[PDB]
C-alpha cells in the first residue's frame, strides 16, 4: 500500500556535522566518529563528535570505577573461573553491609565495604553527569529542562540508595548490585511493606508509566501521520504553525474533543514522564519511615 515512514527509503550523507558553536569550548569536543548506514534507516547516521571536558572525564572515570568494582567482586565470586562467571552472571551480587553496621563505614571490604565503595563511585559518576546535562545546555544557550527532568530520575535513585537508607539508620536498607538480586530486593520490599499496590504513590507512578507509553505512542504516531506536511519540524511549526500542526490538533479534537499545540504537547510529555519517578520517589521514601504497611495504612484511607 502506502509508505509509512518508520524506516527511510533513501539516505543522503553530506559533510560531517560538527554542530553549532555558541559558547562551547570546541577544544573539548572530539572529532566525528563513523557513519552507521544501519542506524540511518531509522535515525541519523552520524556518530560523534562528543564533548568531553573534565566533568565528563570525572563521570566517565567514576562510572567505570563503579562498574569495575562490581565486576571484580563477581569474578571473585566465580572463583576467578571464566566459565562460572558467564554461567552465574545474573546470580552474582554485591550486597550492602549487614544491619549490624547501621550507617557506618566500619564493615569489611568482603562484607559490604566494597558495596559502599562501588556506591561512592556511583554517587560521583551520576551527580557530575547531572552537572554535565546542565552545563552542555548552558554552553548552548538552551533551557535547563533536560537537567531538571534528569533530576526527577536522580530523585528516585537517591531515595533508594541514599536518603531512605540514611533515614532508616542502616545501609542494609539499600539495593544490591546484581541482576537477579535487585529484582529480589524489589519483590521483598513489596512483601515487607504490605504490597505496594496499596501505596497510592506506586499507583500514581504506574499511571504515569503506562501514561508515558500511551502519550509517546500518540505523539509519535501523530508526528509520523503528519510527517507528510513536515510535522517533525517541531520548532518551526511552533514559530509558524503549518497545516501539519493543524491537522494534528484536529484529529485529536475530533477524536477526544480537546487537543494540544505543537509546543504544549511537549509540556504534557516532559511532565507525564518526570511524574513517574517523582511520585515513585515519594512512595518509596514514605515506606518504612512513615508507613510500615500500605494495606494497613490504606484501611484508614490514611
Amino acid at each position: 500500500a502506502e509508505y509509512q515512514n518508520i524506516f527511510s527509503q533513501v539516505q543522503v550523507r553530506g559533510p560531517a556535522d560538527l554542530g553549532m558553536t555558541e559558547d562551547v569550548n570546541l577544544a573539548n569536543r572530539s572529532g566525528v566518529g563513523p557513519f552507521s548506514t544501519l542506524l540511518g534507516w531509522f535515525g541519523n547516521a552520524q556518530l560523534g563528535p562528543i564533548y568531553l571536558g573534565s566533568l565528563g572525564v570525572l563521570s566517565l572515570f567514576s562510572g567505570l570505577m563503579w562498574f569495575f568494582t562490581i565486576g571484580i567482586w563477581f569474578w571473585y565470586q566465580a572463583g576467578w573461573n571464566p566459565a562460572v562467571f558467564l554461567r552465574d552472571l545474573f546470580f552474582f551480587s554485591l550486597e550492602p553491609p549487614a544491619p549490624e553496621y547501621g550507617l557506618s563505614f566500619a564493615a569489611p571490604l568482603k562484607e559490604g565495604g566494597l558495596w559502599l565503595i562501588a556506591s561512592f563511585f556511583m554517587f560521583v559518576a551520576v551527580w557530575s553527569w547531572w552537572g554535565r546535562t546542565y552545563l552542555r545546555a548552558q554552553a548552548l544557550g538552551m533551557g535547563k529542562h533536560t537537567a531538571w527532568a534528569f533530576l526527577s530520575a536522580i530523585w528516585l535513585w537517591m531515595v533508594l540508595g541514599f536518603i531512605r537508607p540514611i533515614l532508616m539508620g542502616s545501609w542494609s536498607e539499600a539495593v544490591p548490585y546484581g541482576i537477579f538480586s535487585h529484582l529480589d530486593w524489589t519483590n521483598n520490599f513489596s512483601l515487607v511493606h504490605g504490597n505496594l499496590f496499596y501505596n497510592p504513590f506506586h499507583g500514581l507512578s504506574i499511571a504515569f508509566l503506562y501514561g508515558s507509553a500511551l502519550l509517546f505512542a500518540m505523539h509519535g504516531a501523530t508526528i509520523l501521520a503528519v510527517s507528510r506536511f513536515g510535522g517533525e519540524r517541531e520548532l518551526e511549526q511552533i514559530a509558524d504553525r503549518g497545516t501539519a500542526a493543524e491537522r494534528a490538533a484536529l484529529f485529536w479534537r475530533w477524536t477526544m474533543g480537546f487537543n494540544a499545540t505543537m509546543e504544549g504537547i511537549h509540556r504534557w510529555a516532559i511532565w507525564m514522564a518526570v511524574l513517574v519517578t517523582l511520585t515513585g520517589g515519594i512512595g518509596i521514601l514514605l515506606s518504612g519511615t512513615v508507613v510500615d504497611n500500605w494495606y494497613v495504612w490504606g484501611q484508614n484511607h490514611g
Partner: protein, 240 residues
Amino acid sequence: DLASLAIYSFWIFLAGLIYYLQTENMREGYPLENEDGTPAANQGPFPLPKPKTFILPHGRGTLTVPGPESEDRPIALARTAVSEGFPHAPTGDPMKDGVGPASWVARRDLPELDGHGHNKIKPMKAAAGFHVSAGKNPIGLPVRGCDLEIAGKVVDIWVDIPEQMARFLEVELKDGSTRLLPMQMVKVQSNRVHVNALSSDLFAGIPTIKSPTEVTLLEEDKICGYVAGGLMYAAPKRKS
C-alpha cells in the same frame, strides 16, 4: 498523618498542573469560533493564558501567542445545512482551492533557515557535497501516478542539510518545468517512483515554487497540502 498529607497535597498539585497544561495548549486556535468566524458563545472553563513572546533567530522577528487569529486566505467552502456541525461543501475544485485534505496554511513566504542562517532545504545538486548514501537512488526514475500513467521524471532530491535527509523529489513534467513531491508521499521502487495520491494529470496542478533553488514555508504547505488532498479527491481515477 504524613502520608495522607502528602497524597492530598499531590492531588491538589496535579489539579493545578493540568490547569497550567490545558491553558498552555490554548496559545493557538483559541478563542473558539462559530462556523461564521465570530467568537463562539461558550468558551468552556479554561481562560486564555497571558501571552508569551518567542524571539525568532536571524531577524525573522517575534511570535506572540495567544494572539489575534485569522486564516489570511480565502476559504472556498459553503455550509450544507441550516444548523452548526454539518460538513461544508467546497464551492469550487477543492484541490486548487486548498480546502479539505488539500488545505494549506498561510505560513511565512520564506524558507526555514538552519542554525547558521542558511536555507535548510536545497536541491541536492546545489548542496555540497551531499550524495545518496544508501537505498535506491530515485534520480532519473520515471514518476507514475495512481492512474498508472507516467507523469514525469525525478531530476533531483531536495534535502535537509542540518538533518541530512531526503525531503522532496524534484520531478520534471511533460512541459519541462518541475514540481516538488513530498518524500513521504512517494514509493521508490527498483524501476520507477510511484505516487498513489495523484493521478498523472494532476501533477501539473501541484503548486509551483517562485525560485528554483529554494522553497518557502508557504510553498511547502501548498505542495504537501495539494498532494495529500489527492488521496480523497483523485478517488475517481484510482484504480488498482
